[PDB]
Amino acid sequence: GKGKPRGLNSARKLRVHRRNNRWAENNYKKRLLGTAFKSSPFGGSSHAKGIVLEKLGIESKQPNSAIRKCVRVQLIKNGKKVTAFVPNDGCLNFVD
Amino acid sequence: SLPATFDLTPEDAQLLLAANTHLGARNVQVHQEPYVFNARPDGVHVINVGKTWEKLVLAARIIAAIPNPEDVVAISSRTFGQRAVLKFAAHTGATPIAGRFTPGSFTNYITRSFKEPRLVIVTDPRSDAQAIKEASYVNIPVIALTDLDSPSEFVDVAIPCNNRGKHSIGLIWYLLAREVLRLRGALVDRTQPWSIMPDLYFYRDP
Amino acid sequence: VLVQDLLHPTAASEARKHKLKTLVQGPRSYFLDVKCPGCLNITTVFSHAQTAVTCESCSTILCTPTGGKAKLSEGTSFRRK
Amino acid sequence: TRSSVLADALNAINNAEKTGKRQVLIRPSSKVIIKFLQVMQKHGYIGEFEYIDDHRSGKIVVQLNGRLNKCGVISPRFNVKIGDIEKWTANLLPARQFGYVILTTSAGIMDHEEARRKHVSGKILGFVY
Amino acid sequence: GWVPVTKLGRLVKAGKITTIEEIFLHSLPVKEFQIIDTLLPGLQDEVMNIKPVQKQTRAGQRTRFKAVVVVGDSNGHVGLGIKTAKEVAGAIRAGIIIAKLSVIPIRRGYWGTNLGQPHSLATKTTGKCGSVTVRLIPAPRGSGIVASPAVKKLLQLAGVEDVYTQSNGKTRTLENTLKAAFVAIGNTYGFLTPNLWAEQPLPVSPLDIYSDEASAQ
Amino acid sequence: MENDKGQLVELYVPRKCSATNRIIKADDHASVQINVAKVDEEGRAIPGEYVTYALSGYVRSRGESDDSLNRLAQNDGLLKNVWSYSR
Amino acid sequence: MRAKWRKKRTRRLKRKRRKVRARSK
Amino acid sequence: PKKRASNGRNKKGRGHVKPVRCVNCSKSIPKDKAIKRMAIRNIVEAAAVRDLSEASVYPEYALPKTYNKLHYCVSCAIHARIVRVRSREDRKNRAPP
Amino acid sequence: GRVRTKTVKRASKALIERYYPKLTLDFQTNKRLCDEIATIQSKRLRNKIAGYTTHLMKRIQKGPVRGISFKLQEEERERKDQYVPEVSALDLSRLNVDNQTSDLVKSLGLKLPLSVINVSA
RNA sequence: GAAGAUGAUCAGAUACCGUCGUAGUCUUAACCAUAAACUAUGCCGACUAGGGAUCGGGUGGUGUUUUUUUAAUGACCCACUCGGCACCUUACGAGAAAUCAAAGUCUUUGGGUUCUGGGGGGAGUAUGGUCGCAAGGCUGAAACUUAAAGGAAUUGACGGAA
Ligand SMILES: [Mg+2]
Ligand SMILES: [Mg+2]
Ligand SMILES: [Mg+2]
Ligand SMILES: [Mg+2]
Ligand SMILES: [Mg+2]
Ligand SMILES: [Mg+2]
Ligand SMILES: [Mg+2]
Ligand SMILES: [Mg+2]
Ligand SMILES: [Mg+2]
Ligand SMILES: [Mg+2]
Ligand SMILES: [Mg+2]
Ligand SMILES: [Mg+2]
Structure with a gap:
């Protein structure tokens, strides 16, 4: 009978079964747990201002071989420390 | 539609009973259960020779409807039907393949053995399975000399006969040649027997 | 066979088939007018009769039950139905 | 256990029509089966069908001619308003020009075309095309 | 020749x-x-x-x-x-x-009315090759070929003017996608519609009519 | 199929199997067409005039081509006592 | 790394973790 | 994937058979799986029959036999060349030679 | 190591196929006519081809050879296979018939001279 | 015969191998509740294909054996039949394929129902609850990380495989 119940009065089993199996998605689990506000440094937001603490030079992953020229940024709205890439040629000379 | 003479004459019944064309296989295919008549103890089934003659005459009517006669290809891979196929070939138009079929004969249009029959007759649908399989690729009707155990896969006109005996195979090919010539008009009258007597169609040693 | 008469199957086929798997299901059992060598009276005994059947006047066992048909015992005579 | 004799009947009809048989045998032969088969026969998808009366539930031998592609059952018998018959026809039928969605309607068991001409609707049984 | x-x-x-x-x-x-x-x-x-x-x-x-x-x-x-x-x-x-x-050959038809010169398919058809299922649905006039740019090209070379397409399986396999669509537009004559129900007198093959011209020596 | 002004638009109305009524399609290469000769008085062949049967590839590949052709030949009188309706 | 022996390694890690947790509690 | 339909053994409808021991290493192998060869030898030789019959009392004695059903495991039978690994199409053959 | 290649065997086969009313069981005669009926590019290859032709002719003289297809072999095989025995099998030399085959005759509605023997299972 | 003891060998010090040997293996009373607990294939129902072999029961042979002048019951043979463990051929069909008479009757998608899965790790982890004398069992995340992991098959290469 292809798995699921089919009968006319079996809508609660289908609805609760979809509600239970709906949690295995990444986006539904993330959105209903609200992990963008609990974690993930920008608290659900797109952009955030911070204050540079130190310029880092990150080793690029293999097989690439370069220094990636990032900064360590402490966010104003959280106090969380993140690492941010300064994304062009030069441009680490531009920050401070 | 066949008026009165195409009934099984008692002389033809003498031929079919004396050649043991009515001795069917012990195991009977479910598609060949129509041709069985009341299996005897020891398990040997009895082929209905009336239905054998009717299917033989129907096969002869199908053979004598292809306009040119040299593309009614007669197949025998078996020693009991080599001479029967070659004499059928000599008496009718009837391109023979006596011996090895050489696969790629009905497909494979660049071989030396490339034929396009409008009809294929086979002595045995088991041993001649390559001819039937290859005729299933290029739209060719198949008349077979089936037994009660031989498969009817891609077989359109199954003449139920004894495949084990050489006398049965040679007689059925002889009768098919005779009926095709009678339908063509090469034999003048259906009532007199053919002057060709049935022992040039049997396998011999030596 | 790809074409057949299912309304009128042959009696040899219907007598081969199971009693539930025929066109209309009915029993293959029957009843027997059975008389003893001794007594003159007639007893109606089932074929698959499950019971040591006696007469009303007899003391004698007419049939003994088995796995299928009852075995009509001891030289008694029978007639169908 | 046996929950839909119409589904069993129409499955037997499909399975014999796929293998090319000219007849089926159907057990156990309900009124819904008889009316569904009468609609199919009216539209030409089967031939004569004959009801064997044993004294229990009946059997049917249907003569399948050659013209059936897929008869089937929509289980459960969904409630079908008159506005969404055409969703069901667009879903189940191969074209707008043929094929019929059979409805159980309080004016009788009928296809969707003369459900529309009678302006009636109701539960869905299945389809034939 | x-x-x-x-x-x-x-x-x-x-x-x-x-x-x-x-x-x-x-x-x-x-x-x-x-x-x-x-x-x-x-x-x-x-x-x-x-x-x-x-x-x-x-x-x-x-x-x-x-x-x-x-x-x-x-x-x-x-x-x-x-x-x-x-x-x-x-x-x-x-x-x-x-x-x-x-x-x-493919069978063009109508989404449905018989206003002249068929534009779409006559029947929802399907075809499978490998994992790829390609389903073609009749579509109204002016819909065009709603298909991926290879199935669309095959249906354009079929003379289909209007068709809808569903697809399942790994459609990035172009050989399987094109063979599935090819099987699908082959199945249009696979389907038996009620307008084809009429009995036809079963003609003689040209190899039988012109048997002298064939098989030359 | 036709349009609103008559005018059959088919390009080709396909042949049908004489046994199972399926459409014999353009790449059904196992499908055959068998011509049986029409036998006149005193048993000649009448070259040209046939009794024609089309069998699809399905029937032959399932092995019922022989029994189907027995039925359709007996219905046209080419056989007398070969095919029986009640098996 | 056989999954059986990695499972046994994590099972020993379970015992050490609950031993130190019962030590603190 | 499934290399064999009867998975390596002969167990259709049991769930448990019993284990026996290999004769070469005493591995515990199930009795249906094991590999079973009946060794029926003469008690003397193919060549010492003449010596024993010449230096035997009771003329035309019996030349008796010894009987031993041997259960091997798969590794021991393959190593002793009892079963000898086969091709994909040929391993379906269940004929004794 | 005297196996002959296909350029020897095929050429020799073709030479017998179209020149049987010619070349005989003698290698020297075959070698001399291989210069005229064929253009073999070397003396060693001509000698090999003529020697294999001689070997196959000596082989044909005691029973035919498969693969060699000339016009005379068809005719001699056909006049050997045209044998008809006058002892005339399938004729009534006494028809020994079983009981079910006698029932077959009676069901067919024909009158045959039969001889029924009981069959043991 | 875990552990443990001991004898050899090994580059490191092959844990394999030899001889002992505790717990254990067995049983009673109570616990545990897991296995590649596998057919890696939930349960009920219907239909679709040929075949032979076998197990249990039933039915029929004017069958064989108990030949004793029309020879019980068992055993056997033959044909049916129902139920079962399976098997062989084919691919109608299905499948990514290996293969499958079910893993078929599925884009021509709906017979009834329960359970489970949602890329790989982290992780069957942390924590909470509950069960257990314990070992643990059942339930069971997240942060973080990652562009593959994997399945089937083909060609090659390699094998202390033939
Ligand atoms: Mg997708
Ligand atoms: Mg492996
Ligand atoms: Mg187990
Ligand atoms: Mg578990
Ligand atoms: Mg499991
Ligand atoms: Mg359950
Ligand atoms: Mg059974
Ligand atoms: Mg995951
Ligand atoms: Mg768990
Ligand atoms: Mg816990
Ligand atoms: Mg795995
Ligand atoms: Mg793999």
């Missing part, structure tokens, strides 16, 4: 069979591409994909080139041919031959 073997060729390139529907009616096997060249002269060709396929050798990876070619006039016929060869030009040159030999 060009010294034909295969009796069908000796009839077609002599002039006894003049339309390709006479071949398609009797299901005559076509083994020479010049039959299709004479009967369908306006049979345009489109290479859809060239890919390299490799076989690991005792020393090295030998590669051949596999071409899919869709041929077909835009009035009801296509052929899909797939051929691998050492060179891409040989792959095209022989894939055109295989696609010419594989020409089948």
Whole structure:
């Protein structure tokens, strides 16, 4: 009978079964747990201002071989420390 | 539609009973259960020779409807039907393949053995399975000399006969040649027997 | 066979088939007018009769039950139905 | 256990029509089966069908001619308003020009075309095309 | 024509069979591409994909080139041919031959009204090759081919003006996608509609009518 | 199929199997067409005039081509006592 | 790394973790 | 994937058979799986029959036999060349030679 | 190591196929006519081809050879296979018939001279 | 015969191998509740294909054996039949394929129902609850990380495989 119940009065089993199996998605689990506000440094937001603490030079992953020229940024709205890439040629000379 | 003479004459019944064309296989295919008549103890089934003659005459009517006669290809891979196929070939138009079929004969249009029959007759649908399989690729009707155990896969006109005996195979090919010539008009009258007597169609040693 | 008469199957086929798997299901059992060598009276005994059947006047066992048909015992005579 | 004799009947009809048989045998032969088969026969998808009366539930031998592609059952018998018959026809039928969605309607068991001409609707049984 | 073997060729390139529907009616096997060249002269060709396929050798990876070619006039016929060869030009040159030999008819119809000159398919059809399922649905006028740009090209060379398409399976496999769509538009004559229900008198094959012209000596 | 002004638009109305009524399609290469000769008085062949049966590839590949052809030949009188309706 | 022996390694890690947790509690 | 339909053994409808021991290494192998060869030898030789019959009382004695059903495991039978690994199409053959 | 290649065997086969009313069981005669009926590019290859032709002719003289197809072999095999025995099998040399085969005759509605023997299972 | 003891060998010090040997293996009373607990294939129902072999029961042979002048019951043979463990051929069909008479009757998608899965790790982890004398069992995340992991098959290469 292809798995699921089919009968006319079996809508609660289908609805609760979809509600239970709906949690295995990444986006539904993330959105209903609200992990963008609990974690993930920008608290659900797109952009955030911070204050540079130190310029880092990150080793690029293999097989690439370069220094990636990032900064360590402490966010104003959280106090969380993140690492941010300064994304062009030069441009680490531009920050401070 | 066949008026009165195409009934099984008692002389033809003498031929079919004396050649043991009515001795069917012990195991009977479910598609060949129509041709069985009341299996005897020891398990040997009895082929209905009336239905054998009717299917033989129907096969002869199908053979004598292809306009040119040299593309009614007669197949025998078996020693009991080599001479029967070659004499059928000599008496009718009837391109023979006596011996090895050489696969790629009905497909494979660049071989030396490339034929396009409008009809294929086979002595045995088991041993001649390559001819039937290859005729299933290029739209060719198949008349077979089936037994009660031989498969009817891609077989359109199954003449139920004894495949084990050489006398049965040679007689059925002889009768098919005779009926095709009678339908063509090469034999003048259906009532007199053919002057060709049935022992040039049997396998011999030596 | 790809074409057949299912309304009128042959009696040899219907007598081969199971009693539930025929066109209309009915029993293959029957009843027997059975008389003893001794007594003159007639007893109606089932074929698959499950019971040591006696007469009303007899003391004698007419049939003994088995796995299928009852075995009509001891030289008694029978007639169908 | 046996929950839909119409589904069993129409499955037997499909399975014999796929293998090319000219007849089926159907057990156990309900009124819904008889009316569904009468609609199919009216539209030409089967031939004569004959009801064997044993004294229990009946059997049917249907003569399948050659013209059936897929008869089937929509289980459960969904409630079908008159506005969404055409969703069901667009879903189940191969074209707008043929094929019929059979409805159980309080004016009788009928296809969707003369459900529309009678302006009636109701539960869905299945389809034939 | 060009010294034909295969009796069908000796009839077609002599002039006894003049339309390709006479071949398609009797299901005559076509083994020479010049039959299709004479009967369908306006049979345009489109290479859809060239890919390299490799076989690991005792020393090295030998590669051949596999071409899919869709041929077909835009009035009801296509052929899909797939051929691998050492060179891409040989792959095209022989894939055109295989696609010419594989020409089948499709059944255009209507989304539904019989206002003239069929634009869409007559029936929802499906086809499978590998994992790829391609379903074609009849579509109204002006819908166009709602298909991926290879299935769309095959249906454009089929003369389909309007069709909807569903697809399942790994459609990035272009060979399987094109073979599934090819099976799907082959199945249009697979389907038996009520307008085809009428009994027909079952004609005689051209190989029987013109048996003298075929099988030349 | 036709349009609104008559005008049959088919390009080709396909043949049908004489046994199972399926459409024999253009790449059904196992399908055959069998011509049986029409036998006149005193048993000649009448070259040209046939009794024609089309069998699809399905029937032959399932092995019922022989029994189907027995039925359709007996219905046209080419056989007398070969095919029986009640098996 | 066999999954059986990695499972046994994590099972020993379970015992050490609950031993130190019962030590603190 | 499934290399064999009867998975390596002969167990259709049991769930448990019993284990026996290999004769070469005493591995515990199930009785249906094991590999079972009946060794029926003469008690003397193919060549010492003449010596024993010449230096035997009771003329035409019996030349008796010894009987031993041997259960091997798969590794021991393959190593002793009792079963000898087969091709994909040929391993379906269940004929004794 | 005296195996002959296909360029020897095929050429020799073709020479017998179209020149049987010619070349005989003698290698020197075959070698001399291989210069005239064929253009063999070397003396060693001509000698090999003529020697294999001689070997196959000596082989044909005691029973035919498969693969060699000349016009005389068809005719002699056909006049050897045209044998008809006058002892006339399938004729009534006494019809020994079983009980079910007698029932077959009666069901067919024909009158045959039969001889029924009981069959043991 | 875990542990443990001991004898050899090994580059490191092959844990394999030899001889002992505790717990254990067995049983009673109570616990545990897991296995590649596998057919890696939930349960009920219907239909679709041929075949032979076998197990249990039933039915029929004017069958064989108990030949004793029309020879019980068992055993056997033959044909049916129902139920079962399976098997062989084919691929109508299905499948990514290996293969499958079910893993078929599925884009021509609906017979009834329960359970489970949602890329790989982290992780069957942390924590909470509950069960257990314990070992642990059942339930069971997240942060973080990652562009593949994997399945089937083909060609090659390699094998202390033939
Ligand atoms: Mg997708
Ligand atoms: Mg492996
Ligand atoms: Mg187990
Ligand atoms: Mg578990
Ligand atoms: Mg499991
Ligand atoms: Mg349950
Ligand atoms: Mg059974
Ligand atoms: Mg996951
Ligand atoms: Mg758990
Ligand atoms: Mg816990
Ligand atoms: Mg795995
Ligand atoms: Mg793998």
